[PDB]
Amino acid sequence: ETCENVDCGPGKKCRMNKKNKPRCVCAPDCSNITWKGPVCGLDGKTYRNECALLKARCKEQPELEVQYQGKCK
C-alpha cells in the first residue's frame, strides 16, 4: 500500500515508514502559526516554538496548549 488517497485528518499527513507502510503522522503546518518564538506550554514545559508544541499535542498530549509566550519560568 501507498500514501495515495489516504486522508489523515487535521494536523496529520501520510508518510511511508521504514517498514514500507503508509502511516499518518503528526505534522502541523508551522506556516499557519503567527508567533515564531518559544512558548510555555500548559504542562509547564518550554517548547522551542509553537509548532513543536502542536506536534506534541498531536502525538502525546491532547490537552496541551500555549499558556504564555516566551520561555517557561
UniProtKB/Swiss-Prot annotation:
Disulfide bonds join 3-14, 8-24, 26-58, 30-51, 40-72. Residues 2-25 form the Follistatin-like domain. Glycans are attached at residue 32. It is found in: Secreted; Nucleus, Nucleolus. One of its GO terms (molecular function) is heparan sulfate proteoglycan binding. Residues 20-73 form the Kazal-like domain. Its main location: secreted. The keyword Zinc does not apply. GO terms for biological process: ameloblast differentiation; BMP signaling pathway; cell differentiation; cellular response to growth factor stimulus; female gonad development; gamete generation; hair follicle morphogenesis; hematopoietic progenitor cell differentiation. Keywords: Disulfide bond, Glycoprotein, Nucleus, Repeat, Secreted, Signal. GO terms for cellular component: cytoplasm; extracellular region; extracellular space; nucleolus; nucleus. Interacts with GDF11. Interacts with activin A/INHBA. Interacts with myostatin/MSTN. Multifunctional regulatory protein whose primary function is to antagonize members of the transforming growth factor beta (TGF-beta) superfamily including activin, myostatin, GDF11 or bone morphogenetic proteins (BMPs). Mechanistically, binds to these ligands in the extracellular space, blocking their type II receptor-binding site to inhibit downstream signaling. Plays an essential role in muscle fiber formation and growth both by preventing the repressive effects of myostatin and through SMAD3/AKT/mTOR signaling independently of myostatin. This is Follistatin. The gene is Fst. The chain holds residues 93 to 165 of 344 of the full protein.
